[PDB]
Amino acid sequence: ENITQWNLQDNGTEGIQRAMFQRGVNRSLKGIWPEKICTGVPSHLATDTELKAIHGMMDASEKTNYTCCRLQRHEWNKHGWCNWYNIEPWILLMNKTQANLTEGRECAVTCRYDRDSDLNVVTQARDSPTPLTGCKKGKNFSFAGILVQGPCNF
Ligand SMILES: *[C@@H]1O[C@H](CO)[C@@H](O[C@@H]2O[C@H](CO)[C@@H](O[C@@H]3O[C@H](CO)[C@@H](O)[C@H](O[C@@H]4O[C@H](CO[C@@H]5O[C@H](CO)[C@@H](O)[C@H](O)[C@@H]5O)[C@@H](O)[C@H](O)[C@@H]4O)[C@@H]3O)[C@H](O)[C@H]2NC(C)=O)[C@H](O)[C@H]1NC(C)=O
Ligand SMILES: *[C@@H]1O[C@H](CO)[C@@H](O[C@@H]2O[C@H](CO)[C@@H](O)[C@H](O)[C@H]2NC(C)=O)[C@H](O)[C@H]1NC(C)=O
Ligand SMILES: *[C@@H]1O[C@H](CO)[C@@H](O[C@@H]2O[C@H](CO)[C@@H](O)[C@H](O)[C@H]2NC(C)=O)[C@H](O)[C@H]1NC(C)=O
Ligand SMILES: *[C@@H]1O[C@H](CO)[C@@H](O)[C@H](O)[C@H]1NC(C)=O
Ligand SMILES: *[C@@H]1O[C@H](CO)[C@@H](O)[C@H](O)[C@H]1NC(C)=O
Secondary structure, three states: OOEEEEEEOOOOOOOHHHHHHHOOOOEEEEEEEOOOOOOOOOOOOOOHHHHOOOOOOOOOOHHHOOOOOHHHHHHHHHHHHHHHOOHHHHHHHHHHHHHHHHOOOOEEEEEEEEOOOOEEEEEEEEOOOOOOEOOOOOOEEEEOOEEEOOOEOO
């Protein structure tokens, strides 16, 4: 039921995707998304110490040199607190997921079509199929180097 999305490395994409490439990171968790978007004041303000426990998840913000915790805190604030109620379960889930991603079903979400390699370079992916964005029709996909015929590797 919850969408799990992550960034993939790409030198061609400015931001976390280039940062991940430069650092040899292939997958960095974006979020775990239930249907409900949290609006208003969080039940608990997430601490950098609590967020840094999501080992492997690089921050999407340059203002922390793609480390922690703007994006991590964004996730807690936007999709976290109103669905999990307490930071502990959320931290434990976010962490296990990132770890699974770090340690090796992945559908493309957004591509950057590279003309020099005739490839749909996957910049964001998820655990379920989704309408693609910026993916050229009929071209192969590159999921952090892995070449796949379809938009999903399953
Ligand atoms: C998909 O996404 C949904 C969210 O939309 C998610 O569902 C949520 O799952 C979390 C757990 O992962 C669950 O959170 C618990 O909620 C209950 C109340 O509903 C709380 O009691 C829990 O907190 C736990 O208890 C502590 C305090 O409580 C007391 O203290 C003692 C401690 O000695 C405990 O043993 C007892 O529980 C006692 O009552 C808390 O302080 C701790 O944090 C502790 O974990 C959790 O907060 C939510 O209810 C679910 N919400 C919904 C909407 O479903 C689901 O897991 C996701 N699934 C997947 C597969 O991704
Ligand atoms: C992390 O990876 C493990 C191993 O692939 C997942 O565990 C399996 O999950 C399936 C489906 O949920 C279960 O039926 C199996 O019994 C589990 N096997 C093992 C060896 O653990 C786990 O679900 C993954 N967790 C996350 C959050 O991605
Ligand atoms: C977060 O996940 C990591 C894996 O990415 C877990 O790492 C372990 O850290 C503790 C020491 O702090 C030990 O169990 C091992 O040295 C680590 N194991 C591995 C495989 O790296 C960590 O347990 C997780 N933390 C939380 C809070 O879930
Ligand atoms: C990565 O991109 C930068 C800027 O576009 C470029 O100068 C560099 O040569 C690229 N490196 C690789 C290995 O593609
Ligand atoms: C950003 O991080 C990388 C690797 O951790 C490092 O090369 C760089 O110097 C860091 N700091 C700044 C300010 O760029």
